[PDB]
Structures are given as C-alpha cells and as structure tokens.
Amino acid sequence: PIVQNLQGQMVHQAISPRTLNAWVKVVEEKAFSPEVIPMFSALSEGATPQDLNTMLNTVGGHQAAMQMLKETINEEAAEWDRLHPVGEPRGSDIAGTTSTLQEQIGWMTHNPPIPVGEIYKRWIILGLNKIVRMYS
Ligand SMILES: Cc1[nH]c2ccccc2c1CC(=O)N[C@@H](Cc1ccccc1)C(=O)N(C)c1ccccc1
C-alpha cells in the first residue's frame, strides 16, 4: 500500500503476509458470499495495482471464478482505453500488467492524481460482484 512515512513522503509499504492470509481466509470461509466484498475493501486500503495482483494471485482453486474476474478486469481495462485513447495510464497499466510499482505510485501522487489502485479496486469489485451473484 501507499503510506505517508514519518518524513511525510508518500511511499510504498510492502503488502503483509497477514493481509494475504486474511484475504484467502475470507474467500475460503465465506465461499464468495457478499461478505467477501467489504473484506476485500478493508484489506486493500491504499493498495497499488501491484499489491492487488499479489492479493488476487494467492487465491488457489476457484479457477472458473478467478478466470471470470480476470475477464471482467480485461473488459474494464479495454473500456478505460476507449475513453482514454491518449496519455498514461493505459488500462493495462491500471491492472498492473504493463506498469511498475513506481509508475503506480507516481500516478497515485500526481497532480492531479490518477488513483490507479482505487480504479483497479473498483474493477476487481465489479468482478467479485459477478462471482458473488453467480455463487449465490
Ligand atoms: C497464469 C494465470 N492464469 C489465470 C487464470 C485465471 C486467473 C488468473 C490467472 C493467472 C495469473 C494471473 O494472470 N494473475 C493476475 C492477477 C489476477 C488473479 C486472479 C484473477 C484476476 C487477476 C496477474 O498477476 N496479472 C498481472 C493480471 C492482472 C489483470 C489481468 C491480467 C493479468
């Protein structure tokens, strides 16, 4: 996640193994109940796309669900590019596939900012909503 350090520079703090376990624990315990959504949000405060990918990648099994989530992300990335045919970030940059941590932090702190972690979080939550709907 992005944090303000004591200096207060805005910098990246490494994602915690505790956060990753907490995320997998909720997915496994609640079996993609609606409860997964607020938990995903609570665990991803300040997340960069790199952080979010590391979170999502720790979910094992649920291959079909994860594939659906990836397709939702791909669709949102393509829609971003349709509405932003110039400039940076690209949709793939928001999803962290073609961007670096430094690029992500730069966009998040730019003036004006492009909150790429929040945008990606929104896309992921849209994907999670479809999974939740499907598994209900
Ligand atoms: C190699 C592979 N095959 C998959 C099939 C389904 C889901 C994930 C994978 C992967 C790894 C995989 O692609 N994981 C994703 C993160 C991810 C995980 C789970 C769901 C959605 C996004 C990832 O690391 N990146 C860079 C990524 C992010 C957005 C779109 C495409 C790729």
Author numbering: 1 to 85, 96 to 146
Task: Please share text taken word for word from the publication where this structure appeared.
Capsid is the primary structural protein of HIV and a critical part of the viral replication cycle, both in the assembly of viral particles and in the infection of host cells. The capsid protein (CA) of HIV-1 plays critical roles in both late and early stages of the viral replication cycle and is widely viewed as an important unexploited therapeutic target. During assembly, the viral RNA genome is packaged into a capsid particle composed of a lattice of CA protein hexamers that form a distinct fullerene cone shaped particle. After virus fusion with a target cell, the core is released into the cytoplasm and CA is thought to undergo a controlled disassembly reaction in order for reverse transcription of the viral genome to occur properly.
To further understand the mode of action of this novel class of compounds, we determined the crystal structure of HIV-1 CA NTD protein in complex with PF-3450074 using a CA protein construct that contained a single glycine residue in place of the cyclophilin binding loop (residues 87–99). Although the cyclophilin binding loop is important for viral infection, it is not required for proper HIV CA protein folding and in vitro multimerization function. Binding affinity of PF-3450074 to the crystallographic construct (Kd = 3.42 µM) is similar to that observed for both full length wild type CA (Kd = 2.79 µM) and isolated wild type NTD (Kd = 2.24 µM), as measured by isothermal titration calorimetry. Using this construct, the co-crystal structure of PF-3450074 was solved with the NTD of HIV-1 CA to 1.8 Å resolution. The structure of the complex showed that the overall fold of the CA protein is the same as previously described CA structures and illustrates that neither the compound, PF-3450074, nor the loop deletion caused any significant shifts in the protein structure. PF-3450074 occupies a preformed pocket in the HIV-1 CA NTD bounded by helices 3, 4, 5 and 7. The R1 and R2 aromatic moieties of the compound occupy two hydrophobic sub-pockets and provide most of the key interactions which anchor the compound to the NTD. The indole substituent protrudes from the NTD R3 sub-pocket close to Lys70. The binding site for PF-3450074 is distinct from the sites targeted by CAP-1 and CAI/NYAD-1. These results confirm that PF-3450074 directly binds HIV CA and are consistent with this class of inhibitors acting via a unique mechanism. In the model, the R3 indole group which protrudes from the NTD in our structure localizes to the interface between capsid monomers in an assembled capsid and sits directly between the NTD of one capsid monomer and the C-terminal domain of another, making contacts to Tyr-169, Leu-172, Arg-173, Gln-179, and Lys-182.
